[PDB]
């Protein structure tokens, strides 16, 4: 478990490892924003 002083931030750390997947997805939205140049 996290150190006591940090356990309150568990719900953020629970979503923390998964952001790289979103980065890939963000790329597509960016290319969707410029209409797939």
Partner 1 sequence: VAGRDIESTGFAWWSGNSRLINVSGKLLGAHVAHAGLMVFWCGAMTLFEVAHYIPEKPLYEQGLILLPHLAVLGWGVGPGGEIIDIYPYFVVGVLHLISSAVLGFGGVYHSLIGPDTLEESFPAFGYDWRDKNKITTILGIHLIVLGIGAFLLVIKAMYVGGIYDTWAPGGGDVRIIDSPTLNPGVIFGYVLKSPWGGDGWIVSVNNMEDLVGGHIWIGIICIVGGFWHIFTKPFAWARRAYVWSGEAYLSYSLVAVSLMGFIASQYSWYNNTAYPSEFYGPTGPEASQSQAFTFLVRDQRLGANVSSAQGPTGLGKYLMRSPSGEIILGGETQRFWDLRAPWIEPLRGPNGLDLNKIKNDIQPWQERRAAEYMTHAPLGSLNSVGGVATEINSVNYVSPRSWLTCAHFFLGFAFYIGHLWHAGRARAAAAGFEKGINRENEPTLSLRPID
Partner 2 sequence: MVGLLQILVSILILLSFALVVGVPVILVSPGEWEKSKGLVYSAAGLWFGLVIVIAAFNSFV
Partner 3 sequence: MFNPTTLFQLIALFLVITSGPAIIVLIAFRRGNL
**Residue for token pair 């006591």:** 4
Residues 6-25 that bind partner 3 (CB under 8 A): 11-12, 14-15, 19, 22-23, 25
Q: Looking at 1, 4, 8, 19, which residue binds ligand 8CT (CB under 6 A)?
A: 19
User: Helices marked H in the chain — which ranges?
Assistant: 10-15, 19-33
Residue 29 tokens read as 């939205």
Residues 2-31 that bind ligand CLA (CB under 6 A): 24, 27-28, 30-31
Q: For partner 3, how many residues bind (rule: CB under 8 A)?
A: 13
DSSP 34: T
Shortest distance in whole angstroms from residue 8 CB to ligand CLA = 23
> What is the distance between the alpha carbons of residues 23 and 32, in angstroms, rounded to a whole number?
14
């Amino acid at each position: 478990k996290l150190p006591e002083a940090y356990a309150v931030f568990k719900p953020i750390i629970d979503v923390a490892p998964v952001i790289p997947v979103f980065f890939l997805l963000l790329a597509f939205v960016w290319q969707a924003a410029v209409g797939f140049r």
